[PDB]
């Protein structure tokens, strides 16, 4: 639904790299370069953003 606040495997906090991730992808950067530029070294953190599906943007579209 919404970005997890901390990575499940190592509790690294990834809940503040969602908008930065989206901004570096709009600038032309690959998902690899983008996840690198955010400080996500070990692949347990990289999967936390790489495979996130933001469904809070589709629920926030039905009437109040």
Partner 1 sequence: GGLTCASAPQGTLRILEGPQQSLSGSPLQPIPASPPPQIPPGLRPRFCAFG
| Annotated binding-site ranges for Zn(2+) | 7, 10, 44-45
What's the rounded Cα separation, in Å, for the pair 30 and 61? 29
What's the rounded Cα separation, in Å, for the pair 16 and 18? 6
Find the binding residues for Zn ion in span 20-59 (CB under 5 A). Answer: 44-45
Find the shortest distance in angstroms from Cβ 30 to partner 1: 9
What's the rounded Cα separation, in Å, for the pair 54 and 56? 6
Tell me if residue 13 falls in helix, strand or coil. Answer: strand
44 binds, among partner 1, Zn ion, none (CB under 5 to 8 A by kind): Zn ion
User: Where does this chain touch Zn ion (CB under 5 A) — which range of 9-17, 19-27, 29-37, 50-58?
Assistant: 9-17
């Amino acid at each position: 639904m919404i970005i997890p606040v901390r990575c499940f495997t190592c509790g690294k906090i990834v809940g503040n790299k969602w908008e930065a991730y989206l901004g570096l992808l709009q600038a032309e950067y690959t998902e690899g370069d983008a996840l690198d530029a955010l400080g996500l070294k070990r692949y347990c953190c990289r999967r936390m953003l790489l495979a996130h599906v933001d469904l809070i943007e589709k629920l926030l579209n039905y009437a109040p």
